[PDB]
Amino acid sequence: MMVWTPVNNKMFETFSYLPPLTDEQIAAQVDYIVANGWIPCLEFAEADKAYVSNESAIRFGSVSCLYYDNRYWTMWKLPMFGCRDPMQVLREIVACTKAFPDAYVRLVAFDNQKQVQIMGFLVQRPKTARDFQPANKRSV
Amino acid sequence: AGAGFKAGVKDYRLTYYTPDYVVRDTDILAAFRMTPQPGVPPEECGAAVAAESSTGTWTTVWTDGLTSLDRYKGRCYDIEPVPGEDNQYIAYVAYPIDLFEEGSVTNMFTSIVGNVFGFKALRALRLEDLRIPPAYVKTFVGPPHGIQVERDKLNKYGRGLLGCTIKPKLGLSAKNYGRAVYECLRGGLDFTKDDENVNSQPFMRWRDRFLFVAEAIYKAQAETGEVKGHYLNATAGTCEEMMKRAVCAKELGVPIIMHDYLTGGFTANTSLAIYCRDNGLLLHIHRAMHAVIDRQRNHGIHFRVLAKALRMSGGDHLHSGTVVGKLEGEREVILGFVDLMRDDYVEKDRSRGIYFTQDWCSMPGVMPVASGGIHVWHMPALVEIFGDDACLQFGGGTLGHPWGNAPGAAANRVALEACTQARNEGRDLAREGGDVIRSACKWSPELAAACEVWKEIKFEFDTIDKL
Amino acid sequence: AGFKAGVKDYRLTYYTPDYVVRDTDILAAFRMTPQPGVPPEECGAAVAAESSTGTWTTVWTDGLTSLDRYKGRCYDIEPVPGEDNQYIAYVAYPIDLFEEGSVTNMFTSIVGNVFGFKALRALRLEDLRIPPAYVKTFVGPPHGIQVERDKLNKYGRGLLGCTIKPKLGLSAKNYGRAVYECLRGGLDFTKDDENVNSQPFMRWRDRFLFVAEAIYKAQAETGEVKGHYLNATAGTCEEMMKRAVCAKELGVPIIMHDYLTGGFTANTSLAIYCRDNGLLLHIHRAMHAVIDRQRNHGIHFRVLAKALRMSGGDHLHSGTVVGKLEGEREVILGFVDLMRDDYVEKDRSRGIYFTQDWCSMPGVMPVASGGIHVWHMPALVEIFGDDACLQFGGGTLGHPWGNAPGAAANRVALEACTQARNEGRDLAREGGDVIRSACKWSPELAAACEVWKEIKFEFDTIDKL
Amino acid sequence: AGAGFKAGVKDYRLTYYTPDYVVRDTDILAAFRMTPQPGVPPEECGAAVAAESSTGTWTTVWTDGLTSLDRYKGRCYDIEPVPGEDNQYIAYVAYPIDLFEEGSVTNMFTSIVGNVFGFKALRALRLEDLRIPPAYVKTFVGPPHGIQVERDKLNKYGRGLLGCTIKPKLGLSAKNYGRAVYECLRGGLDFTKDDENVNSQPFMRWRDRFLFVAEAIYKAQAETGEVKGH
Amino acid sequence: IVGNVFGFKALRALRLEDLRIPPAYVKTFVGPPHGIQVERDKLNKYGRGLLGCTIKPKLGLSAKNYGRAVYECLRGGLDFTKDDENVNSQPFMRWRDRFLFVAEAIYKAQAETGEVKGHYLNATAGTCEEMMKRAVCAKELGVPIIMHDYLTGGFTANTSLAIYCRDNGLLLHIHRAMHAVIDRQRNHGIHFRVLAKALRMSGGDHLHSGTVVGKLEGEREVILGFVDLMRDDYVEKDRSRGIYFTQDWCSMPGVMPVASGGIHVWHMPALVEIFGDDACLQFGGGTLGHPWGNAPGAAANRVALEACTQARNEGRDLAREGGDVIRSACKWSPELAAACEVWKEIKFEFDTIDKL
Numbered sequence A: 001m002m003v004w005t006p007v008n009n010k011m012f013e014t015f016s017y018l019p020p021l022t023d024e025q026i027a028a029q030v031d032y033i034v035a036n037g038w039i040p041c042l043e044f045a046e047a048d049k050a051y052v053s054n055e056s057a058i059r060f061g062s063v064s065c066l067y068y069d070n071r072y073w074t075m076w077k078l079p080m081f082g083c084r085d086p087m088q089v090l091r092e093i094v095a096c097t098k099a100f101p102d103a104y105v106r107l108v109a110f111d112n113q114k115q116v117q118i119m120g121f122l123v124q125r126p127k128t129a130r131d132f133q134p135a136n137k138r139s140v
Numbered sequence B: 001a002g003a004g005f006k007a008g009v010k011d012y013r014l015t016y017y018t019p020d021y022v023v024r025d026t027d028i029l030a031a032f033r034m035t036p037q038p039g040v041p042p043e044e045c046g047a048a049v050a051a052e053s054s055t056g057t058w059t060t061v062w063t064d065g066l067t068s069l070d071r072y073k074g075r076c077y078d079i080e081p082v083p084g085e086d087n088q089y090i091a092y093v094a095y096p097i098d099l100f101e102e103g104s105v106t107n108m109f110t111s112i113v114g115n116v117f118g119f120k121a122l123r124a125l126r127l128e129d130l131r132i133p134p135a136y137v138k139t140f141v142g143p144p145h146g147i148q149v150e151r152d153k154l155n156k157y158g159r160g161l162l163g164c165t166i167k168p169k170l171g172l173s174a175k176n177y178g179r180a181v182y183e184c185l186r187g188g189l190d191f192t193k194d195d196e197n198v199n200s201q202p203f204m205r206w207r208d209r210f211l212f213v214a215e216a217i218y219k220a221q222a223e224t225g226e227v228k229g230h231y232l233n234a235t236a237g238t239c240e241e242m243m244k245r246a247v248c249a250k251e252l253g254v255p256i257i258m259h260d261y262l263t264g265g266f267t268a269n270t271s272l273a274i275y276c277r278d279n280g281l282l283l284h285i286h287r288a289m290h291a292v293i294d295r296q297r298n299h300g301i302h303f304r305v306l307a308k309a310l311r312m313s314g315g316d317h318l319h320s321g322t323v324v325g326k327l328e329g330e331r332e333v334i335l336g337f338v339d340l341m342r343d344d345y346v347e348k349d350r351s352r353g354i355y356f357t358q359d360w361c362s363m364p365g366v367m368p369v370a371s372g373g374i375h376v377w378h379m380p381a382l383v384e385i386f387g388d389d390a391c392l393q394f395g396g397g398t399l400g401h402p403w404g405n406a407p408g409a410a411a412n413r414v415a416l417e418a419c420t421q422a423r424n425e426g427r428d429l430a431r432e433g434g435d436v437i438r439s440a441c442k443w444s445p446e447l448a449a450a451c452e453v454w455k456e457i458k459f460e461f462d463t464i465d466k467l
Numbered sequence C: 001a002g003f004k005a006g007v008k009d010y011r012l013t014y015y016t017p018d019y020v021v022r023d024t025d026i027l028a029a030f031r032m033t034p035q036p037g038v039p040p041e042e043c044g045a046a047v048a049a050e051s052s053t054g055t056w057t058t059v060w061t062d063g064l065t066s067l068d069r070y071k072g073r074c075y076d077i078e079p080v081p082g083e084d085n086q087y088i089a090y091v092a093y094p095i096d097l098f099e100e101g102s103v104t105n106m107f108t109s110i111v112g113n114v115f116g117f118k119a120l121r122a123l124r125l126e127d128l129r130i131p132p133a134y135v136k137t138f139v140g141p142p143h144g145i146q147v148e149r150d151k152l153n154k155y156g157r158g159l160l161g162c163t164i165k166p167k168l169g170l171s172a173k174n175y176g177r178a179v180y181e182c183l184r185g186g187l188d189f190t191k192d193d194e195n196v197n198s199q200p201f202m203r204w205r206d207r208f209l210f211v212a213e214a215i216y217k218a219q220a221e222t223g224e225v226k227g228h229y230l231n232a233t234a235g236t237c238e239e240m241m242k243r244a245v246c247a248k249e250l251g252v253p254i255i256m257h258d259y260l261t262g263g264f265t266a267n268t269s270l271a272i273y274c275r276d277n278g279l280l281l282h283i284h285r286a287m288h289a290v291i292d293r294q295r296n297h298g299i300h301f302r303v304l305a306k307a308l309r310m311s312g313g314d315h316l317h318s319g320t321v322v323g324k325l326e327g328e329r330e331v332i333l334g335f336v337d338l339m340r341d342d343y344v345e346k347d348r349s350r351g352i353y354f355t356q357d358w359c360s361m362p363g364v365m366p367v368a369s370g371g372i373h374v375w376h377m378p379a380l381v382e383i384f385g386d387d388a389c390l391q392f393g394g395g396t397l398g399h400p401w402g403n404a405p406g407a408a409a410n411r412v413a414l415e416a417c418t419q420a421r422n423e424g425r426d427l428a429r430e431g432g433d434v435i436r437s438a439c440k441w442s443p444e445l446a447a448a449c450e451v452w453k454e455i456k457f458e459f460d461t462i463d464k465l
Numbered sequence D: 001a002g003a004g005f006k007a008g009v010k011d012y013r014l015t016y017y018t019p020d021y022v023v024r025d026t027d028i029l030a031a032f033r034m035t036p037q038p039g040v041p042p043e044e045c046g047a048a049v050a051a052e053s054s055t056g057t058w059t060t061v062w063t064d065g066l067t068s069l070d071r072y073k074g075r076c077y078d079i080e081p082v083p084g085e086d087n088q089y090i091a092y093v094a095y096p097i098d099l100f101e102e103g104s105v106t107n108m109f110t111s112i113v114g115n116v117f118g119f120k121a122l123r124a125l126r127l128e129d130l131r132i133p134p135a136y137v138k139t140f141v142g143p144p145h146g147i148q149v150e151r152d153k154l155n156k157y158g159r160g161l162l163g164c165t166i167k168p169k170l171g172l173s174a175k176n177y178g179r180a181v182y183e184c185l186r187g188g189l190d191f192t193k194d195d196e197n198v199n200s201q202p203f204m205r206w207r208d209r210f211l212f213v214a215e216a217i218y219k220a221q222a223e224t225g226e227v228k229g230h
Numbered sequence E: 001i002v003g004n005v006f007g008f009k010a011l012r013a014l015r016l017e018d019l020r021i022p023p024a025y026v027k028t029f030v031g032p033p034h035g036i037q038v039e040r041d042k043l044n045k046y047g048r049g050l051l052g053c054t055i056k057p058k059l060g061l062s063a064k065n066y067g068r069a070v071y072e073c074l075r076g077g078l079d080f081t082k083d084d085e086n087v088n089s090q091p092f093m094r095w096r097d098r099f100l101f102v103a104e105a106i107y108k109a110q111a112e113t114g115e116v117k118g119h120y121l122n123a124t125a126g127t128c129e130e131m132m133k134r135a136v137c138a139k140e141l142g143v144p145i146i147m148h149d150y151l152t153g154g155f156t157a158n159t160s161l162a163i164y165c166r167d168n169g170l171l172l173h174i175h176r177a178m179h180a181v182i183d184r185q186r187n188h189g190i191h192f193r194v195l196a197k198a199l200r201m202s203g204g205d206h207l208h209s210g211t212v213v214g215k216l217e218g219e220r221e222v223i224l225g226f227v228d229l230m231r232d233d234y235v236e237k238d239r240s241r242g243i244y245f246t247q248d249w250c251s252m253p254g255v256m257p258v259a260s261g262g263i264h265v266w267h268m269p270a271l272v273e274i275f276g277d278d279a280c281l282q283f284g285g286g287t288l289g290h291p292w293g294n295a296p297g298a299a300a301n302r303v304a305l306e307a308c309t310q311a312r313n314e315g316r317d318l319a320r321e322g323g324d325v326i327r328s329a330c331k332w333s334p335e336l337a338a339a340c341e342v343w344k345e346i347k348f349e350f351d352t353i354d355k356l
């Protein structure tokens, strides 16, 4: 029996339980976005704004149900409307991560018919992050 | 003298069988699978169903003359014979929108399925489908949030949601409930839930459970950095108790409650759905009792109608069946009503049991929930059947893991993410599914332990509810 | 005994043929049809497990509690005579499993998921033994038969009612017009049709007001207490309560609720309101035949009737035997006793699988309704006796001379049959004579007798014992 | 690359004039009598009206791409010249039912007549008619009773109803108001009424009036044997 | 005053131009929940016009996307954003979902910038009961400001809301939707200056006043007239500005004028010159139509406003040097330069219907 560690084992929604995505695996996800006609976009946050928190609820009456701070991140430029070239998305990942080397950065895609985000996963975490385990140290 | 009052009994078909009627776009339409008694013509049987679910009774009444029966009567406008059946017919009935109370699923059911199923003149009757027109759909508050808003509130995109019913069904203390909840959530499940029959009982009172569960949700959320929830059961004996339980969830600031809509009922359910809308709570709907009504091919109400009724009454989630699990539901049948639950516009398609084109006129979609007898090996099939817009629940499939709840949750979460990744890369889950899982069990020790325990476990039986 | 992960047979834990049932246990009798290759013991054990504590695979958490204490137990399996693949499986549920005062919770456990299991082809709940210790947790009927008779000051005969027709399409004013004319002729009650709630053609509050005028007019005219079951059935509990409050504020005697389409949670709420405000509650069983018609699958009405008595209702529709809707004599006699009586012994010839002790919970008045007319009167009086309401919708509003003569005809027929019974006449044998003598004496009754003389409803019974 | 965001001002007609659009039975339709400024084509004027009462503003916004403008936009689908007029047109606009809050006349007016009447590019604008579809009508509670129920409650049939506004409009005391009301009702009128501007004022407070009027209604009703109201 | 007389057969047209509301009648009104001074004091904002922005497209955005656009607008330098007048509660976006996501956006932008932020959440509704529910949610979320469409909602509802806002410390932004149905034509209707006085009495902290230079009509001298009537304590008769009566407001709080509709960076000098600091300037298309997105669009508008304000404070005449001021700013700021490039040639110049 292995024990799932509760210490420094923070996750990041979709794909965070798999081995970290290789560049080839990231490019395959981007192909998926383009093949389906979805709208790619990049979002980023500094470390203190990366995970869901409760601080604003100090101002509330009894209305905190499904309110969390840090769900919104910051938009990198604009969503790439009409983009059909995967290489263009990959170049924006590079540009975003270069401008904000110490930020969390996630790639998302939007469906304008459902009007919802249809995909998303982390593409960068700051090198100073120490609140996550590598896949082989998640259970002891 | 014109037409006057003549006392006495006449055939229903003289008034209620109208084969040349052109249906109106505001009419509610019903498709009844009808088995008449020997010596009862199908036309008379369909007319009877139409009459006794709208305006008519067994003998002529004088009061008809004070109103306009033409304006109000239900109309059997078409009868199809059933292929393969000697004595089965599909009777189509049209009901004027005027017959129904705005916003009341209760009233719609009371007319359409109130008395006609007990008539001596028929041997069996099944309601297969309803066409709910936009003009009536627009009278309903509908689901408190819907699929898009739920995903947006939870900040969860790109994969199926993962859930888990706490087991044993009954008999756990409040503290042990919260203990199990925390260990499930912290391992990678998005949700856990009260079992449908967990309300308030001598072994565990509801408010004790809500508090310990709140502690568990917040602990797992802090630990993982992901939004967590537990469907706290508001199902109760009275509306007043139901509401007290909802109010406590609100005051704890937790995301989600649940209701058993058939055993609690449509009147209570609609009330709760309005409450959840006004207070920002997600509402998970359990379909307990549905199979009493919906299992048999010859008599009852098909689940697709019970699903439409829930979407109108209000619910953010509704259980849909698994195809591959311990409870019955055929692939094509399920795919049909999943579309009716989620989509805005669904065209007639008899190969999936859809008898009418259904326009939902922008009423929010309801998230289907696949639950019951499913485990890691089922994951590729589930993802292939439902896509991302579904919750997949693993009760026994998490709490039955050899290493406990957190490893059990991580096994399920790894399996889902592996399949989601594989699909996104262009792999065919219908054929390559076993390969995706085997590669994953080889990589993840948690998943391997799950794969080994349940490798030979299948649920394959003759289907009762065939199209 | 440690935790061993994996699937094992349900019967290893949940089939207990040597279990001695406790007097506090809830007992269930399930008519069960297993799939080929599934032993009856395993199928019965699956039903017991999945309606109580168990799931499809072994869970570690069992060890934290006492499964012995909480598990439902299949303790007996009877083969069904005449059936190759049907069995009666008897399951015992500890009283600890259930929420006090909640019919909703009882149903959620007992009939929640098990009917959809792949491993069975069909399942029907035939009966439930509700023990006194559980009965006592329920408020129950707002009033019951004795108190209802006492408040209405009506004794010595069946009550007479009538559903206003056409079902839908009448204006509020025309509704009260029909109601006045019915009540003034001899009927004790009239009623909203089950599906009369609030609609474009007639809004509920308009109807409530005009109906109140009609009740009070007919009461003043006849010198007898009158009522009309005003339908509180609604889309939401809040709307339901608004309609009950208006009834209270008008001082009228009685409201109705469609307990199955409204639901048990709403119904229990309404019954408590009625208790606390002195309103009689008439319960319409709309939708029941969706659930209870077929012999092989569903829930028999006797269980739905027990559930209503617990949830709360002063009247409940019972069937007619002789009218347009199905219900066999012996079946109906069985659950009428279950609805009215304090103690009903096991009797399989009437479909009573368990001795039922109601521990002083008030009885519910059976209502015979649907396709009945004057010629049925002797049979109805003979089947039900005095403690019943007999309802004639079409049989009153279908009279050639209108509502008041129609009501008079039904009232004369009832009183003639009642008097005959009291004098020692056998209604089963002499019923036709009693009615013929009455049609000869009463011109109103004669008109009714003439119109419906040849009208019978005789068909093959689906729901056979 | 497909349809992306291009910043800047373009003609409204490129998006909002759709003369080939087939209206849906759930659409709210509007008939606007439109007088454009010199140099503004009627098509552009109708499109502006359609845009600025539905989804659009004066310059292109990027956020359009997150939703479906095809689904939500108002559509000027037909323009008729007005006979007798050199510079008047009837512009027909269709609005998807999704644009409107259920049961709210306030919201319907806010969209359809909210801003467009003040646009510099038009000289005059008149909303002539609206097609309210059944699917939207059904979202409204509507009239408390209506003609049939009113007649039934009052027990009055076979003739028009007779009413009368109390005069002078303002300046009568509550007691004098009831005195005038009684004398009107007792002579054969079904109703009397407060003048529109009689609310609550220094010469006559509302509750004083309501009580004296109640006395008057009941006196006239007893005297005549006919239901009276005020 | 306007009940029946406009329909009389004996007249061909009638227009109410002005009303003299005496102090003895003014004093009977609760009036605006806060007023200009209190609003500035609660927001801690002084020395410049306030900057706002209507979210676009008008209708069709989901609650999540609404908050997303709001966060990006606010974080770039705008003080406020707002629901469009017709954004109430609809199938595409239900009000309570919007209120919650907008709250997240306000608090994120406020934390990020260190400046107080708000978003006018629309309380306009079909019934007084629904209107109040929405006001109550805003109160419980701790947010600064809501809005109401006083003419389409109506005066009875508006006065109720204003009293609620006074008792609960919410700022109340008033949108004048429908006013031009009433006030556009010179020969018939009611002039906006009367509708403005009525609003000051009924209660509102902000009221839209027109732009002079934007897409909706309103002449400079006309607007200057009623802006004084909205803000000042005492306004003398002046027929050259359409003021027919001397108006004494007897210390009733002033209402902040809101300039909105088809305005962009090049209008900034003119707007600052016309209104001065006690105004809110709103840029919907002028922010969400920026080629670089909402935050840069907001930053462009904020830079422009501050540049003009600084110039004015230094003694420069914005009426003649305004062009120079903006050009120096477009040269200095890339965000601004992008805005300047896009809307350079865009003007709204038509013959005026509502002349004095």
Ligand SMILES: O=C(O)[C@@](O)(COP(=O)(O)O)[C@H](O)[C@H](O)COP(=O)(O)O
Pocket (backbone or CB within 6 Å): B165, B167, B195, B196, B287, B288, B319, B320, B321, B326, B327, B369, B370, B371, B372, B373, B374, B393, B394, B395, B396, B397, C050, C055, C056, C113, C116
């Ligand atoms: O009580 C149960 O059996 C479950 O908790 C599943 O347990 P497991 O996860 O351990 O199987 C669910 O309620 C059923 O799936 C409901 O069936 P359906 O979805 O068809 O309504």
Ligand SMILES: O=C(O)[C@@](O)(COP(=O)(O)O)[C@H](O)[C@H](O)COP(=O)(O)O
Pocket (backbone or CB within 6 Å): B052, B057, B058, B115, B118, C163, C165, C193, C194, C285, C286, C317, C318, C319, C324, C325, C367, C368, C369, C370, C371, C372, C391, C392, C393, C394, C395
């Ligand atoms: O809708 C009807 O048909 C009735 O109003 C009877 O009308 P008539 O008197 O004209 O037949 C009753 O509701 C049914 O009898 C209900 O059936 P049950 O009592 O079996 O539940």
Ligand SMILES: O=C(O)[C@@](O)(COP(=O)(O)O)[C@H](O)[C@H](O)COP(=O)(O)O
Pocket (backbone or CB within 6 Å): D052, D057, D058, D115, D118, E054, E056, E084, E085, E176, E177, E208, E209, E210, E211, E216, E258, E259, E260, E261, E262, E263, E282, E283, E284, E285, E286
């Ligand atoms: O709907 C609109 O057009 C606006 O949101 C402006 O949008 P833009 O910023 O994109 O122009 C405002 O409501 C109008 O300015 C109202 O006009 P007024 O202030 O004259 O009442």
Ligand SMILES: [Mg+2]
Pocket (backbone or CB within 6 Å): B165, B195, B196, B197
């Ligand atoms: Mg369960």
Ligand SMILES: [Mg+2]
Pocket (backbone or CB within 6 Å): C163, C192, C193, C194, C195
């Ligand atoms: Mg009925």
Ligand SMILES: [Mg+2]
Pocket (backbone or CB within 6 Å): D165, D194, D195, D196, D197
């Ligand atoms: Mg008047």
Ligand SMILES: [Mg+2]
Pocket (backbone or CB within 6 Å): E054, E083, E084, E085, E086
């Ligand atoms: Mg606007």
